């Protein structure tokens, strides 16, 4: 996804 | 650690400008001490030149 | 819409169908203060239950009775405006019917005789406006609900246990509405505490001993009981076969000559069915195995009277012996376990150091009110008040509910109050989680979370201050006369007048009203947030609050946030939530049975929604029809799954419905990263309105609704037709349709105009219509501030362009076209109020006056008779708007000056020049000036020209609406004397007054003409009146400060050109700042000669991850083109023709497989007429997630004659040379951002100081002085600059001598002067000196 | 800078509440005792020498 | 989660992906929010201490 | 506080506040909305007052030294000296010691 | 003190010395008196704790309060800074700037630096006084603007962004006047500043004194900070577009176009390079010396012909003057960036780094404007082989749910199974990315 895993 | 480190330094208007303003005074007023104005942040608090 | 709305409707681009319409955006605002103020609803909230909860007052002497009938609420002493005018809240008065009563007859059981009866008045209460919003001295506020955990009870348990963390404990909390929180938890060693009012924990028993349960009761209470026999000097157990699960048999389970289960031998499940199916209900058990039990009840021995045991005590071979010589043939002990059944109680009651009910009430009133020992009356009333007396506590209906549902009660009425099977339950269920049958619940979730709305807190308010009012009354009794007493002495409504006022005005959750455009003050209403009072503090705040809950999901948007600090805790309401009566978010779905969705509509809790399987809304159907996909996306619990269309219970409306207002308006949204499509929907409440206002060329078609449901744009009540349109005013003349008004015709519409809101911005309403204009229900009359023909504008639709610039774009700096100025595009109006007072001084009265020492006419030049400068004149920094005069403290001068004043001879003046001036930076046109004089002050012709321009107004203001009245109501009495009565050439000749007088033959018309002659009469006499309340107000009142003899506004407007350091900003994130303004042969430009607007540096693009902003490029270039196009059309040889290509065209993209929706054909006129107006810029509207897609946006480009990537050949304005690579350039939607450079940059060399610290201080004409901190003193050191840094810290600061010595070396050109320690160190030794230590400067 | 002459001696509280008490200290005084002295709640016998 | 964002930006992605997006974006603002409150600190701590 | 209390009453039975005539009148003889106004004196309020902005700001910051005088006054009167002592060197001896005498 | 309003205010000290005194005379006035020990116990325990209340609020009991809502303050809470000749405005980028200066607002500058344009406005006759002076520059007046240019000479101003996290959030710079509210910042700067354009202010400050001008212009000054002092890297250095330019001048290519040119030199290379033939480099050799090598001042070489493009030859001309000819020709990098002005600083010193640093940030960017870098839509080039993966991760995942309603894997052998194909296959598709993108 991005950052955090999310993004 | 520099926590323990930081609280520890001698001169009463660096530390008292530090934290704790009231236990570091009467420990200070009580033993009669000089600030010989050695660091930068007694001289700051003065207005000097550090 | 009339005329289709213009017909700019565009396209749809989208084929999902809304099954309903998107509700009042402002409804959780309206709603909630509508339910507030009532009409004796006899229902739960609004004032009405206030009043319910404080009265009757009881008599403290067993007479007196207050108590109360009914409220009313009267109309409010002055309108909006003039509360805006004057700075007075916009509120009603409210009354109260009491009866006090005497409290029965002495001796006479009950229902005393007399009964002294009154209407008390308890103050004012503020009225919420049309948009949802309050006026609260002046200004407007907004009221933000507030989300919390609410009252109710909790089961959890600790995630970090013990310091060693190898363990867990479980706990319960109920929480009240009003009262003592209670608080159950285990500790480490499995006893049970309880915490009163979060207070230190004392065992769990007391608060059963405190009920009146005994040890036994208490230990019958939490135990199932094993019963141990004693016959034929043998030992036996009635056994129930189930409690030998999972153990090893320590002696022979047997039982009628048959051993079941072998010493040592595990216990099987064939055991316990073998013992079932026999049915064995009682073994042999040796004397060790029971005196492991603990006994649940007293024995004596019968025949003595002396106890041998006592209830909870642990059995031993003494004590089963002494039980077996008493001849005791039954023992009751408590069954346990280590797992499913722990004991727990029985620990606690040993760590309990209470005996008994009095010891633990004793017990628990020392831990309330330390330091004294209680009356046993005192501990009984003190423990009774805590729980059981709803004048001190109450869980509230909501919060009964919560309990009841949590506890599997039947019903959710009930009491406030808690009872003791409440508590008992509540020990029970946690014993019963800690026991592992059953589990905690998570508290985060919406189902446990609620919002309290504008009625709520309010009503909460009020509640208090009438609560204080019964106070008084209570003491107001025993004193004073207690025969004679009315309800009018007995209630004073100050308190309660306090209460609601430091509610409206102090509160946190009270907030100046947001208006910088239409959008921002629609989010506001709709804003939740989880601080204030009852609520986070932001050090409660961590990550489980702020996260985004699964259960937001159409209820909470997950995009629009702040950014910063409050991140997680202010939020947005989603577009189709509801709030219900219990204060629960509701969201929509579509009940769907078998395949087939119904149209049906049902409004789901998160509570209830986690029951059912629900299919995103996107999910293909073959219409009606049924359900058209094999396997759907669905939802239900936490968990996402695939599902068959028979399991499909319900299903979402609209993507919209994840999403809150603001994040609808992002155009291909499913695009854009979420951070910064955050970042897009925050920044368009920030965007400022421009007078050349466009709706975008990319809209997402939510930017009509919320022109709507925002009241800046005013909308046609009913069907109709424009009678008068106006810069002033409207005037619309019903029943074109459907003939509505009946009984008096036509409406009157007065628009907004040049208005100053809080901001300093201006809003402003201008005409939609024209004369004789046929408009529907709901269809546009006029368009308020950042709106276009009913769509909402932020900002403008600009020409850009992707590509590196000079440098002049680095780090999201932006390049414009001088054109942009040229064409007055982004361009804002603004409009500043500045106030001076004139006050009463010891020395003498300060007067506002034209006569001020030693100025010249020059400077006096703009100032009336009065010293107020004059409507219309052009004032500059520098410039007088009030001249004023205040008594000089006086003083003689220097000699050196009597001598200079000598020498030109100029006399000096008791008074001392104090006007108010036009700050640095400012400037502009007055447009107004508003003064209040002291009332029966002497007045002059401040006061009077004022005055009398307002007595013309408004007696215009009767005049005209006279004249539409007049023309209203005689228009229809003249179709209607006609029928029957024809008098064409006749009735046109006498005078209107003598149309009356003219009767008509007996017939039910007759009475219509009756009674359109009462109304007349009556609708005139209350203009009258109304005139008359104007020419009342005006020449009286105002009600002044004290000291404070005049008041001057002098409202001042500027228009702001954008310039290089204002901030730009587009809906997806991307913001920067103006860097350059290049004229025009500079600027890249298109083959055919066309510069861009503005150029964008990609790099901005790539790492931020929103991909929008290219897509509405792209679109926005396709769009650019096609109106121009039509442009063309409209330029040479009009036709219908062009119709049939528009019409081919929308349908077109219509006609592209999928298809939103259709339109076509309509009548020519019709069509010329949108023709022209959708061809200066064609519209389009992309939905959220169903929105226009790529191959769609490449079809209209080739309309537009393509490039289809969207890129062109574009020439360097500079060389004539074409940029090495072609570039996309299209039509972006760009707004100017609140943050001007205007308002930020200042500077200061000196100026003024504060008083005890001498520090430089932020003056009025002074801009003050910049902080340089803690880090920036580093800095200074670490470049070991120390004259820079003892300059920061002497000479630019507090050191007095420093200061002017340094300024005079200056002029004069010097070196640094000799320092001074800084003023606040001389503070600080003075103050340790104050404090008694002796502090000693010392030499060498 | 002023005076103000107190009819009767007032103890620092610096010195008295912070902990450890420097006059607490000094006179071998728990909190407690010099507490119930100072405010008035006991008296403390002082220099019998028999 | 079990499943995968199938859908990349340029041919954009259905609304459960996105919202069940919004959780990491929104821990990843307040991270950085704290991130600068909480690096100050530390940054003072080494300051007062060397 | 007699002030007080009638203003109360009023409060209770008219329905809204008083105005200086009517507390005046209900005062009794020697009092009128001239006395009542000028009556009215309030305790002073607390510069450590709390102020909701960013940084805790009390009260006392926002108000301005009047009683020191600003820095190019100084200068300006230096000024003004210096110049009255140069106008003073080019009349004769007599003519200025006259000015200087008056 | 009175307010503006003519309402008094009063610091809290004043009602606790009122309580102090008070008692204290009520004290003397009962012992006078011959009061009970009850009451003189009383009022002195009274005096006490008024005293208490003085010295510290809360220490020893209830705090004293002016009303319940606040409590008073007392001198232990008193015991437990703001600048003249500041300001500050909203940043933007200012390309045109050499590294040591900065753009600064007129309006900004006349109030900073008011009482200097005094002095020197009475030094020269532009004033009889400087009362006049001041009368005269509120006017703005004519001939006051080229004063005031006359005083900021060889003037340096400290520029200050929060937070300060190290010493490179305050450097000075050499203002130069300009029109505008915006202070123009320069780019190489941004980075230590962590500054950028979408909003940030700044505040100016202005050193007084010679000593403290001195030490802005020797210690504080941008151009003389080139490396952080934390890794000893450059910390002015360029960034994004600089780079974005420089890359696209030095790029390899097929270069059919403008292959085959001796470049007579890297003048005549970059006049031909701007007139025809030559776009986004070229293939070709050029004539430029080189040289420059080290251990002895002579330098020289005899012959210096390679293959090069013309963005790599015009590199050459825009004085490197410090050899690393192989350095230049490799294509630019902003890492190769960031490492070849530091080279240059060590080998070639310091003056003439910050010079070579203002020349590769003006090419860098003049180069990156003409480059006619854009992003469309179709810029983002998707894999075909992304459906491919996909499917073929959907049949493992069916293989995987098959195999699991067998009963040969557990639960959570599944979902890990799962977890890791579905990771591996977001590998595979970035893979696909880079390498569609990556040949050509
Ligand atoms: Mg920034």
């Known amino acids: 996804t991005x950052x955090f895993x999310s993004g | 650690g520099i926590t323990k480190a930081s609280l520890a330094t001698e001169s009463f208007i660096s530390a008292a400008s530090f934290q704790e303003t009231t236990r570091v005074l009467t420990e200070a007023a009580v033993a009669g001490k000089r600030d010989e104005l050695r660091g930068l942040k007694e001289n700051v608090i003065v207005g000097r030149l550090i | 819409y009339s005329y289709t709305e213009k017909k700019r409707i565009r396209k749809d681009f989208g084929k999902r169908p809304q099954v309903l319409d998107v509700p009042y955006l402002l409804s959780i605002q309206l709603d909630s203060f509508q339910k507030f103020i009532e009409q004796d609803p006899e229902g739960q909230y609004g004032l009405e239950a206030a009043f319910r909860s404080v009265f009757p007052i009881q008599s403290y002497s067993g007479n007196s009775e207050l108590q109360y009938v009914s409220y009313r609420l009267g109309e409010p002493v002055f309108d909006v405006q003039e509360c805006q005018i004057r700075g007075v809240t916009y509120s009603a008065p409210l009354r109260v019917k009491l009866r006090l009563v005497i409290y029965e007859r002495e001796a006479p059981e009950g229902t005393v005789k007399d009964i002294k009866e009154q209407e008390v008045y308890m103050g004012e209460i503020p009225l919420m406006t049309d948009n949802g919003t309050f006026v609260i001295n002046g200004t407007e506020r907004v009221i933000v609900s507030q989300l919390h955990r609410s009252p109710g009870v909790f089961f959890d348990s600790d995630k970090g246990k013990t310091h060693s963390s190898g363990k867990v404990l479980y706990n319960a909390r109920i929480i009240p509405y009003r009262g003592s929180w209670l608080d159950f938890e285990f500790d480490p060693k499995d006893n049970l505490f309880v915490r009163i009012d979060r207070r230190r924990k004392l065992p769990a028993t007391?608060?059963?001993?405190?009920?009146?349960?005994?040890?036994?009761?208490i230990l019958d209470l939490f135990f199932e009981k094993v019963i141990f026999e004693i016959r034929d000097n043998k030992l036996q157990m009635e056994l129930v076969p189930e409690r030998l699960r999972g153990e090893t048999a320590s002696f022979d389970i047997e039982a009628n000559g048959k051993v079941y289960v072998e010493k040592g031998r595990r216990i099987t499940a064939r055991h316990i069915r073998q013992l079932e199916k026999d049915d064995v209900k009682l073994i042999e058990v040796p004397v060790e195995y029971i005196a492991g039990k603990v006994v649940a009840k007293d024995?004596?021995?019968?025949?003595?009277?002396?106890?041998?045991?006592?209830?909870?005590?642990?059995?031993?071979?003494?004590?089963?012996?002494?039980?077996?010589?008493?001849?005791?043939?039954?023992?009751?002990?408590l069954f346990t376990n280590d797992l499913d059944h722990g004991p727990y109680i029985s620990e606690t009651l040993r760590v309990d150091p209470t005996n008994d009910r009095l010891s633990a009430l004793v017990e628990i009133y020392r831990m309330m009110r330390p330091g004294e020992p209680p009356t046993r009356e005192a501990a009984e009333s003190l423990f009774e008040n805590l729980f059981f007396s709803e004048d001190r506590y109450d869980l509230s209906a909501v919060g009964r509910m919560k309990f009841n549902r949590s506890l599997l009660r039947e019903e959710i009425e009930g009491s406030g109050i808690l009872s003791k099977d409440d508590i008992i339950d509540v020990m029970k269920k946690l014993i019963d989680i800690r026991n592992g049958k059953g589990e905690v619940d998570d508290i985060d979730h919406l189902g446990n979370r609620r919002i309290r709305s504008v009625g709520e807190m309010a009503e909460n308010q009020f509640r208090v201050g009438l609560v204080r009012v019964e106070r008084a009354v209570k003491e107001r009794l025993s004193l004073g006369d207690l025969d004679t007493l009315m309800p009018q002495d007995m209630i004073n409504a100050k308190p309660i007048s306090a209460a609601v006022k430091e509610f409206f005005g102090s509160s946190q959750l009270s907030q100046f009203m947001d208006q910088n455009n239409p959008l921002s003050?629609?989010?506001?209403?709709?804003?939740?947030?989880?601080?204030?009072?009852?609520?986070?503090?932001?050090?409660?705040?961590?990550?489980?609050?702020?996260?985004?809950?699964?259960?937001?999901?159409?209820?909470?948007?997950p995009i629009e946030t702040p950014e910063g600090p409050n991140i997680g805790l202010i939020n947005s309401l989603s577009v189709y939530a509801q709030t219900n009566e219990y204060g629960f978010l509701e969201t929509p779905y579509r009940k769907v049975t078998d395949g087939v969705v119904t149209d049906e509509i049902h409004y789901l809790s998160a509570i209830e929604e986690g029951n059912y399987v629900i299919a995103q809304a996107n999910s293909n159907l073959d219409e009606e029809g049924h359900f058209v996909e094999d396997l759907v996306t669905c939802r239900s619990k936490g968990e996402s799954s695939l599902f068959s269309r028979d399991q499909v219970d319900y299903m979402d409306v609209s993507t919209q419905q994840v999403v809150s207002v603001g994040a609808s308006l992002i155009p291909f949204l499913e695009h854009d990263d979420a951070n910064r499509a955050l970042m897009g929907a925050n920044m368009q409440r920030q965007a400022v309105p421009t007078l050349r206002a466009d709706k975008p060329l990319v809209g997402t078609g939510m930017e009509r609704a919320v022109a709507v449901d925002s009241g800046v744009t005013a909308v046609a009540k009913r069907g109709g037709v424009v009678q008068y349109v106006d810069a002033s005013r409207i005037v619309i003349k019903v029943n074109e349709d459907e003939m509505y008004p009946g009984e008096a015709g036509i409406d009157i519409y007065n628009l907004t105009?040049?208005?100053?809101?809080?901001?300093?911005?201006?809003?402003?309403?201008?005409?939609?219509?024209?004369?004789?204009?046929?408009?529907?229900?709901?269809?546009?009359?006029?368009?308020?501030?950042?709106?276009?023909?009913?769509?909402?504008?932020?900002?403008?639709?600009?020409?850009?362009?992707?590509?590196?610039?000079?440098?002049?774009?680095?780090?999201?700096?932006?390049?414009?076209?001088?054109?942009?100025?040229?064409?007055?595009?982004?361009?804002?109006?603004?409009?500043?109020?500045?106030a001076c007072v004139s006050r009463d001084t010891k020395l003498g009265p300060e007067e506002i006056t034209a006569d001020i020492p030693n100025v010249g006419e020059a400077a006096l030049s703009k100032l009336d008779e009065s010293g107020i400068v004059y409507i219309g004149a052009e004032v500059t920094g520098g410039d007088i708007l009030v001249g004023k005069v205040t008594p000089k403290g006086e003083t003689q001068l220097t000699p050196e000056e009597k001598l200079l004043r000598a020498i030109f001879g100029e006399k000096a003046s008791d008074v001392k020049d104090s006007s108010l001036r036009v700050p640095n930076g400012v400037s502009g046109t007055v447009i107004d000036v508003q003064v209040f004089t002291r009332d029966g002050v002497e007045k002059d012709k401040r006061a009077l020209e004022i005055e009398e321009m307002q007595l013309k107004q408004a007696k215009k203001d009767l005049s005209e609406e006279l004249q539409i009245l007049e023309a209203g109501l005689f228009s229809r009495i003249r179709a209607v004397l006609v029928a029957g009565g024809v008098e064409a050439e006749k009735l046109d000749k006498l005078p209107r007054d003598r149309w009356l007088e003219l009767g008509l033959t007996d017939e039910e018309k007759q009475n219509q003409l009756e009674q359109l002659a009462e109304q007349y009469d009556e609708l005139k006499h209350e203009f009258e009146k109304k005139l008359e309340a104007k020419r009342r107000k005006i020449t009286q009142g105002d009600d002044l400060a004290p000291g404070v003899l005049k008041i001057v506004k002098v409202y001042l407007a500027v228009k702001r050109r954008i310039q290089p350091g204002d901030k730009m900003a587009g809906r997806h994130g991307n913001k920067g700042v103006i860097s350059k303004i290049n004229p025009i042969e500079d600027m890249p430009y298109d083959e055919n000669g066309t510069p861009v607007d503005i150029v964008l540096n990609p790099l901005g693009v790539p790492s931020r991850m929103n991909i929008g902003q290219i897509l509405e490029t792209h679109l926005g270039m396709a769009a650019k083109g096609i109106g121009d196009k039509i442009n063309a059309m409209l330029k040479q040889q009009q036709e219908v023709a062009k119709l049939r290509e528009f019409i081919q065209r929308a349908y077109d993209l219509g006609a592209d497989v999928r298809q939103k929706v259709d339109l076509s054909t309509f009548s020519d006129e019709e069509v010329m007429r949108l023709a022209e107006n959708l061809r200066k810029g064609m519209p389009i509207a992309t939905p959220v997630f169903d929105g226009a897609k790529e191959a769609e946006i490449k079809e209209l480009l080739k309309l537009g004659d393509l490039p289809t990537s969207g890129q062109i050949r574009l020439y360097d304005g500079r060389t004539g040379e074409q940029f090495e690579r072609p570039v996309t350039v299209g039509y972006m939607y760009m707004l100017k951002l609140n943050h001007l450079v205007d308002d930020k940059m200042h500077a200061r060399s000196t100026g003024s100081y504060s008083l005890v610290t001498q520090q430089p201080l932020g003056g009025k004409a002074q801009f003050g002085g910049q902080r340089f901190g803690e880090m920036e003193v580093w800095a200074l050191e670490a470049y070991g600059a120390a004259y820079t840094l003892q300059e920061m810290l002497t000479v630019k600061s507090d050191d007095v001598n420093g200061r002017t010595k340094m300024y005079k070396n200056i002029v004069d050109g010097n070196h640094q002067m000799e320092p001074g320690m800084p003023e606040s160190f001389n503070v600080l030794l003075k103050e340790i000196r104050s404090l008694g230590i002796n502090i000693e400067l010392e030499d060498e | 800078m002023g005076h103000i002459e107190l009819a009767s001696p007032t103890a620092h509280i610096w010195f008295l509440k912070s902990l450890p008490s420097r006059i607490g200290l000094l006179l071998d005084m728990p909190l407690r005792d010099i507490e119930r002295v100072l405010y008035f709640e006991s008296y403390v016998v002082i220099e019998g020498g028999m | 989660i079990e499943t995968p964002i199938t859908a990349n930006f340029r041919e954009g992605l259905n609304v459960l992906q996105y919202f069940i997006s919004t959780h990491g974006a929104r821990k990843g603002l307040a991270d950085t929010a704290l991130k600068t409150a909480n690096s100050g600190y530390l940054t003072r701590r080494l300051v007062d201490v060397a | 506080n007699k002030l007080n209390r009638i203003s109360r009453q009023m409060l209770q039975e008219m329905g809204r506040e008083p105005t200086p005539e009517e507390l005046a009148e209900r005062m009794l003889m020697p009092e009128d909305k001239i006395r009542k106004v000028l009556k009215i004196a309030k305790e002073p309020i607390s510069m450590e007052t709390p102020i909701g902005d960013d940084e805790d700001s009390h009260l006392g910051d926002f108000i301005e030294d009047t009683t020191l005088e600003l820095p190019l006054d100084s200068a300006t009167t230096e000024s003004l000296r210096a110049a009255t002592h140069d106008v003073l060197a080019g009349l004769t001896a007599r003519e200025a010691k006259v000015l200087r005498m008056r | 003190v009175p307010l503006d309003g003519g309402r008094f205010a009063t610091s809290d000290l004043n009602d606790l010395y009122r309580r102090v005194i008070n008692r204290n005379n009520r004290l003397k006035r009962l012992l006078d008196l011959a009061a009970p020990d009850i009451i003189v116990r009383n009022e002195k325990r009274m005096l006490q704790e008024a005293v208490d209340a003085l010295l510290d609020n809360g220490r020893r009991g209830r705090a004293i309060t002016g009303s319940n809502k606040r409590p008073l303050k007392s001198l232990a809470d008193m015991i437990k800074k703001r600048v003249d000749y500041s300001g500050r405005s909203v940043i933007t980028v200012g390309p045109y700037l050499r590294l040591h200066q900065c753009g600064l607002p007129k309006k900004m500058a006349l109030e900073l630096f008011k009482p200097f344009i005094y002095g020197k406005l009475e030094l020269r006759g532009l004033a009889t006084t400087i009362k006049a002076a001041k009368k005269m520059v509120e006017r703005e007046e004519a001939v006051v603007w080229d004063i005031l240019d006359e005083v900021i000479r060889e003037h340096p101003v400290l520029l200050n962004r929060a937070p300060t996290l190290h010493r490179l959030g305050i450097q000075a710079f050499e203002p130069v006047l300009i029109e505008g509210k915006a202070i123009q910042l320069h780019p190489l700067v941004c980075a230590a500043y962590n500054a950028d354009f979408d909003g940030d202010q700044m505040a100016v400050h202005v050193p007084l004194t010679l000593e403290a001008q001195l030490e802005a212009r020797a210690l504080m000054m941008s151009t003389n900070n080139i490396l952080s002092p934390a890794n000893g890297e450059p910390i002015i250095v360029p960034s994004q577009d600089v780079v974005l330019g420089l890359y696209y001048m030095t790029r390899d290519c097929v270069n059919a176009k403008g292959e085959g040119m001796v470049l007579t030199g890297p003048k005549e290379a970059e006049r031909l390079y701007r007139s025809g033939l030559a776009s986004l480099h070229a293939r070709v050799k050029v004539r430029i010396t080189e040289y420059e090598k080290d251990a002895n001042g002579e330098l020289v070489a005899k012959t210096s012909l390679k293959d090069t493009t013309v963005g790599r030859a015009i590199l050459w001309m825009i004085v490197p003057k410090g050899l690393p000819y192989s350095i230049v020709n490799q294509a630019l990098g902003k890492k190769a960036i960031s490492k070849m002005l530091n080279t240059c600083y060590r080998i070639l010193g310091l003056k003439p780094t910050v010079i070579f640093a203002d020349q590769i940030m003006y090419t860098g960017f003049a180069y990156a404007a003409r480059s006619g870098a854009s992003v469309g839509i179709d810029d983002m080039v998707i894999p075909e082989k992304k459906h491919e993966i996909i499917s073929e991760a959907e049949a493992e995942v069916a293989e995987?749910?098959?195999?699991?309603?067998?009963?040969?894997?557990?639960?959570?052998?599944?979902?890990?199974?799962?977890?890791?194909?579905?990771?591996?296959a977001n590998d595979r598709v970035s893979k696909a990315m880079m390498d569609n993108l990556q040949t050509e």
């Open chain 3, 206 to 217: 007391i608060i059963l001993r405190a009920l009146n349960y005994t040890t036994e009761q």
């Open chain 3, 521 to 557: 003050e629609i989010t506001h209403k709709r804003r939740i947030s989880a601080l204030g009072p009852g609520g986070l503090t932001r050090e409660r705040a961590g990550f489980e609050v702020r996260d985004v809950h699964p259960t937001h999901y159409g209820r909470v948007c």
């Open chain 7, 400 to 424: 995987i749910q098959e195999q699991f309603q067998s009963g040969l894997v557990t639960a959570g052998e599944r979902y890990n199974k799962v977890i890791d194909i579905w990771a591996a």
């Open chain 3, 753 to 834: 105009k040049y208005t100053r809101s809080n901001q300093n911005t201006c809003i402003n309403q201008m005409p939609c219509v024209s004369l004789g204009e046929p408009v529907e229900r709901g269809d546009v009359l006029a368009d308020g501030p950042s709106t276009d023909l009913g769509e909402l504008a932020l900002g403008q639709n600009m020409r850009v362009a992707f590509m590196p610039w000079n440098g002049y774009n680095f780090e999201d700096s932006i390049l414009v076209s001088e054109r942009v100025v040229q064409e007055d595009r982004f361009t804002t109006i603004h409009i500043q109020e500045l």
């Open chain 3, 299 to 333: 024995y004596i021995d019968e025949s003595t009277g002396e106890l041998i045991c006592a209830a909870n005590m642990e059995l031993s071979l003494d004590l089963l012996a002494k039980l077996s010589q008493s001849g005791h043939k039954r023992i009751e002990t």
